[PDB]
Design a protein around this nucleic acid. Sequence first.
RNA 1: UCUGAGAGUUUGAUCCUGGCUCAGGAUUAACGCUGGCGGCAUGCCUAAUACAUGCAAGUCGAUCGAAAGUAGUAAUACUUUAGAGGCGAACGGGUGAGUAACACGUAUCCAAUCUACCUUAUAAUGGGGGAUAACUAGUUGAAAGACUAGCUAAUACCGCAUAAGAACUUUGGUUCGAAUCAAAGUUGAAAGGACCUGCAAGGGUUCGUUAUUUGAUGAGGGUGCGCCAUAUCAGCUAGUUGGUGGGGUAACGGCCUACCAAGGCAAUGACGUGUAGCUAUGCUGAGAAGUAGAAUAGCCACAAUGGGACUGAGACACGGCCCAUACUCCUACGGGAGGCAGCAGUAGGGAAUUUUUCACAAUGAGCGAAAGCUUGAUGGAGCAAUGCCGCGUGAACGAUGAAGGUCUUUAAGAUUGUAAAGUUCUUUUAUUUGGGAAGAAUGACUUUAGCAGGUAAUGGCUAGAGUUUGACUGUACCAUUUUGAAUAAGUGACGACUAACUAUGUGCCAGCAGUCGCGGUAAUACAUAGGUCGCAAGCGUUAUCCGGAUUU
Lengths: 682, 77, 203, 80
Amino acid sequence: TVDLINFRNFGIMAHIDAGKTTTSERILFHSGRIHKIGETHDGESVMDWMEQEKERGITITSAATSVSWKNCSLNLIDTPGHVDFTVEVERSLRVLDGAIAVLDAQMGVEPQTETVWRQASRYEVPRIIFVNKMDKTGANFERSVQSIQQRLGVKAVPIQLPIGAENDFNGIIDLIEEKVYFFDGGKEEKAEEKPIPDQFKDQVKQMRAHLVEEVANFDDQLMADYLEGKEISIADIKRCIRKGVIGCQFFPVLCGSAFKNKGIKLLLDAVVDFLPSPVDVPQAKAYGEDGNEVLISASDDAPFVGLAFKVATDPFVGRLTFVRVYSGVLKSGSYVKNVRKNKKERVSRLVKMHAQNRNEIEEIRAGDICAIIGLKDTTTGETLVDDKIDVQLEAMQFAQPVISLAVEPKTKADQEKMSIALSKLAEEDPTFKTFTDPETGQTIIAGMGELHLDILVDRMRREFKVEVNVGAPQVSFRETFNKESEVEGKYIKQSGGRGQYGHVKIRFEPNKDKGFEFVDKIVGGRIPREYIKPVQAGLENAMASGPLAGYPMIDIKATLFDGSFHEVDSSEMAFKIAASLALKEAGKVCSPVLLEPIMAIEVTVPEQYFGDTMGDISSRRGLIEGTEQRDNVQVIKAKVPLKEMFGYATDLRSFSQGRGNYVMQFSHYAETPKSVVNEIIA
Amino acid sequence: NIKSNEKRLRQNIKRNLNNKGQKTKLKTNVKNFHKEINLDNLGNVYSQADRLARKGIISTNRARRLKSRNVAVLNKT
Amino acid sequence: MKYTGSIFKRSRRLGFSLLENNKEFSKGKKRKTIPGQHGNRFRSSTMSGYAQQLQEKQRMQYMYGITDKQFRRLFRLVLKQRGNLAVNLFRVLESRLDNIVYRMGFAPTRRSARQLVNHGHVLLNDRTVDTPSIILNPGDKVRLKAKTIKIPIVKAASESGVVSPFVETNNKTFEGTYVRFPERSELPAGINESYVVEWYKRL
Amino acid sequence: RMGRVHYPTYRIVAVDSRVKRDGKYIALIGHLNPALKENKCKIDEAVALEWLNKGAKPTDTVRSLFSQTGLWKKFVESKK
RNA sequence: UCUGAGAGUUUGAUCCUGGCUCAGGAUUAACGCUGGCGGCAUGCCUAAUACAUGCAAGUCGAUCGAAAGUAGUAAUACUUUAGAGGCGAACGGGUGAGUAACACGUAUCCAAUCUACCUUAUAAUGGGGGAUAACUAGUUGAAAGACUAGCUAAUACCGCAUAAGAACUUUGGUUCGAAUCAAAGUUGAAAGGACCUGCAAGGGUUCGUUAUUUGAUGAGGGUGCGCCAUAUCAGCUAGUUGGUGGGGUAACGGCCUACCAAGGCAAUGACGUGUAGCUAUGCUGAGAAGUAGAAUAGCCACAAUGGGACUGAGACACGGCCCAUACUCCUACGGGAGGCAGCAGUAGGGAAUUUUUCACAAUGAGCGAAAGCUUGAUGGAGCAAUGCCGCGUGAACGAUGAAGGUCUUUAAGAUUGUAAAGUUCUUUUAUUUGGGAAGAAUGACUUUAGCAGGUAAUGGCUAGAGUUUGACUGUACCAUUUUGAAUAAGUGACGACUAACUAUGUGCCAGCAGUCGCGGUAAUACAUAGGUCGCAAGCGUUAUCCGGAUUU
């Protein structure tokens, strides 16, 4: 195979609405150019007629697509297609030895590239900023370099000057290389380089001084050379940019287009120049859940670790699980050990699904990605081993899809199908969580954004072939009540097993947050002890159910009042049933009240929709006594009802471009307002 | 799939061409005998049939029966 | 049950003393009938040929301590050899490894004998049995392994070994030879296997 | 071999050019275990001669068992 | 004779007529409940539906030219054959759609039939001519593919020499629809590659072919006997029916046809109809008989359905070919493609029917002097108590059995129960130690003694001696290898049929239930606490055939 230095992974490190998947498909076709099948004229050009971006995000989603490009192996992985979430972008980041950040110039108002950049900046992985929106009505180059700063502020040093910047991008002026144009719209194969002429020698020279004034600080002999007027050598410039991407000092902001499809040649050139081997890249950390949560490296060496970062379903050939090889060689043809399951599993064949093929293979070296065809028991984060390396079970690097939407139960077949559907979606995301309301025998779906929910439903309905009614979210709706009166109970018999009689008086006492407590007032022998231990049997069982719809009857006190005395019989469990029915009737007639969560919101919104979110919460009738200040965001300490919480993230985002975000802390249960409680009383 | 199946396919298609030629030669010798009925053509048919039976394509029973039917016509003349 | 955990119950209720004065024994309470709140002469027709066939089968397969599946296996294995079902079946059942080890006087109880022989310390046909499933034949030498020549309970049992007109045991060397089958006169007096013979109607 | 694992039982049969073991046979050669070095096969210096003189030589794994009986020492000169 | 269960069902009661049920082995099982191991064997009945994926017979130079390079200047020592050509390719396995019949069981007619290697061995490997791939060039080409142009080898294509024997003409002889032999006509066998000795010839030496020829091998048509249903199907059948001649698969056969024809089967129900794969093997019962011939051994059938041809000895060929019909990938819409009723495995119905299985270790073939290779056949293994099999959840002493469930309801007691407090002891399954496999220790390969055509020459038969070979398995078995009572329990129901029941709610409500039938003014059949017996790592359940019903 290709050398270990040449095993570099690259995940599409961006979000949709940015021309993301168009660029991903363009890169996949550019590095996967094969002519013996006629593909060169089958995927020649890629561009949008965009009225829907979910199709672009889903159909082009490359879970693991490996190809080779003359010097190296390019592992293009377009797992993210959601606008804002963590699992797909995070697995792409973990896999990739270098990152490509797809940014915009026509729409610089995209809100969900800051968190993506922050995720990629955790491991210091090399990043190349590439902009493809420079082919519309309203794009620019100054817009690119200003949006890359106001959104992020990473000092993106422009090594590429776009010849064509609004709707005519067809050339690039380079510093490490020479100026280049693009005569080939759509499919690109040639970088039409041109020299530095007299009309542009100063144009390139000013930015050369710009770049060497930064590069001079590194390797201070360069600073001295600048004293003596010696321009920094291009090799030193390249090494310093490599350090500034793997060390996050400064990154080049390239330029390109995705609708005339210009600017992918020097894109890949700079990717190769600055995104190095899986040993030069700062390796991502792995805290194995099996007790070895320590800082470890991912350098290429003898020990082998195999992490299944993606899965897919197929009945005929078996499950197709995409794995990333971080170190060593993955053995096959025998029993492979799963440390997470801590057992050896018998495997038959292994595979790799490239951009256009499923090659049946057995081994992929570190820095690259592989797959197993079959292996119906695998999870995202597991470690397949053969040399008995340490554990790397990763589950903390991913976060929760927060904001709930209820799902109601129906006939057996669909619910049984969605059982395995959710279970197998939990191995596609180790933090994909779901709730189960007491009012439903089914799950509660979780998402925050419109696109995240749509793509989760798409994964539910495409890979698993199942769809449901996503109902309005509901509450556990706990049950208390207010002052209620005395009730009475009797049981009389003469036939049957034997005659048994009981006659008791009981009252059901309210509380708010104090649970079951007993208040007894029986003194005088009006009910003997033989009929005393019976009646209490009917008390506690009254706390286990609600009279409206089975809601939990918690935080409620029950009080025994009186019984009855008799000589010729009137035995015990007659008193038991009398007390039980007395408690039940008192619970019936209590006219209860309910409890729901009204949560204090820690609203962390950037200071462009602070007023918009302020007005939104005022419409939601919150308690905004003030607002604490932060770096670029304001945090409102407010209150929001759970009813207005349903879609709160979605509505706030629809009113604020999606940058207005949400931080939600769970609060103690409080009395339901008069409007909410009376719709449930029955 | 067995590669030897296609190997014997190659061999048997070439045998198809060769045996078509040889059986057509034998049948045209038989036709010549049936046109000019004489002992010389009977001997030519005998030689051709002996050659084909020696080659081992079809069993000698067919050769013997065809030449017996030919010499029956010989006795009819 | 192929087992117990209070044998004295089985001995008393079955009407046959599995131990003569060590299982129907005055150890506090002592019984000879069905115990509990249902000790009663059932006026319902609980008595027939079926009932006493069952009862004799219970007595015989509970004095041995063996499972009923091996009872049926022994029946089937004897069916390979022509003869008389009753005497041959009872003699083969008596020839059980655990039953013969107890008959040697090597264990105070059939359950204890079964546990000991299973423990991997009984040599028969030069094979230390890890499962007491080897049916003996006249002259089969059962040997006590080097382990069970130092065990106090079975030491005391062996030193009090039992000899019968159809077996013998050398207790000092912890060995036993099954001399012969109990043919028709060395069988227990209150036990009759003929009922199990008549218990089938598919012969 | 066949039967139960670690207790193999080899049933030796005849063949001409295509048939398997213990299926369609001209005549059952006999029974040898791969773990047993002595055969209780139907070998009596006569059936082997019958199989050799009738053509369709049987399975080629009891040749040593026929060699011990001197089958070849007479057949290689009978054919000669 | 091995051998054979009863009871319950009617009128006030009695009996009779008749019927039903449980009472039995047994699972492709499943199923509740839980669960010890391993051995062991089982494992889509339904779906013959597409089959994705790997796989389901490979071996060949001791047949050849060159390809093709390691060392060599090259020749060449050397690697196999892309290709020509050889065998096996029809093996194997699969299911049984369909097939009810010579397929079968059996003796056969084969007078009509071949069978490659093999086999009984007589005859041969004399001599060539010229191609053809390989090689080379061009062409169409995204590839798929694809045409043209030439050269050359052989074991390659095509004649002849000899050619016993033999095919086959005419005469005689012999013989139960021909057996047998004499005379005599015609007529044809290629092809040599390779190793030691020998100048060569020749001898030894290994392959490839040749005829002749005893059989096997697979099978051909018929074949008496028996071979599912089919009257709430009575007429059916125009090669129908047979003959002369001619042609014909391997051949007799209207196999088929020209000619000549009107008959053939049939109330013992013809024809038609759809089905089952047939025998051995699979259970029940004493028996009568019933229950499958799934898968399997033999035979038989498709091998996605229906044809055609070729090869091969045998195919009109699952995994050859061409095609029509079902399907399909990619694509520039020009184009090319194939079959798990092979193994698995997938999709489904179902209760479920195994690995998307490992080595050919041993066994089969095939072929190669030989090293050997592949088998998804085989041998293993997984797999689900999947079924069977055995195992252990203690024992001993110790009380009037201390706790308590049920009864009593006082109130011990007594059931559980020597279960316990109390004292110890035992360890397969709990648990570790090392020995650690048998199975290669087979075919094959190599030294040799004898034999041995030769032994001038290398080699071959028997054997001495060695080579080497695991799917398993640090498995199996051994030894308290060490501490320990510790490591495992559930089910039915207790009114009878047919063992296991006392009380509590319950007024024919609750709910039980295979038959009788259970509960409407105090429930041992219900529900439960409990005790109880039958069992048991399996327990109960239905499923399925006969006998218990002679009660067809």
